[PDB]
């Protein structure tokens with residue numbers, strides 16, 4: 001296991017998807033809110049739909 | 051451009067993500083993007099220009 005800061009890890013995944021790293025760091029706050037909001041949404045969808 | 055920045059405490063180097071092969075920071079192995087204020091965690095350092103001695 002190799003430690004690495006999580007925002008840095010995102011740049012790896014972003015770089016591995018075809019977008020440059022800068023698009024993450026210049027939008028780190030926005031992406032974090034989207035990730036948290038999406039994580040919240042899935043919990044509700046699981047709870048609501050039986 | 052590829053790899054990540056690392057620092058041994060004093061200097062700063064860029065090396066590939068899967069093998070410690072540090073080298074000096076140069077405009078060829080990095081790319082500029084925007085201004086310093088937007089990105090968080092950025093640190094002060096100089097970037098050597100390969101054509102500067104020329």
Ligand SMILES: *[C@@H]1O[C@H](CO)[C@@H](O[C@@H]2O[C@H](CO)[C@@H](O)[C@H](O)[C@H]2NC(C)=O)[C@H](O)[C@H]1NC(C)=O
Nearest residue numbers: 056057058059060061062063064072073074075
């Ligand atoms: C970090 O690495 C740099 C690479 O330059 C080291 O600086 C060199 O250190 C050696 C001894 O290890 C000296 O003989 C050289 O003159 C230094 N060169 C330069 C350009 O500074 C630095 O010592 C390292 N720092 C550590 C290991 O804490």
Ligand SMILES: *[C@@H]1O[C@H](CO)[C@@H](O)[C@H](O)[C@H]1NC(C)=O
Nearest residue numbers: 005006007089090091092093
């Ligand atoms: C977390 O990261 C920020 C941004 O680099 C830094 O200012 C802060 O000191 C870090 N917290 C630690 C290392 O505990």
Ligand SMILES: *[C@@H]1O[C@H](CO)[C@@H](O)[C@H](O)[C@H]1NC(C)=O
Nearest residue numbers: 085086087091092093094095
């Ligand atoms: C250099 O140092 C400070 C503290 O590291 C940093 O916030 C600043 O943006 C850098 N540049 C200048 C011109 O102060």
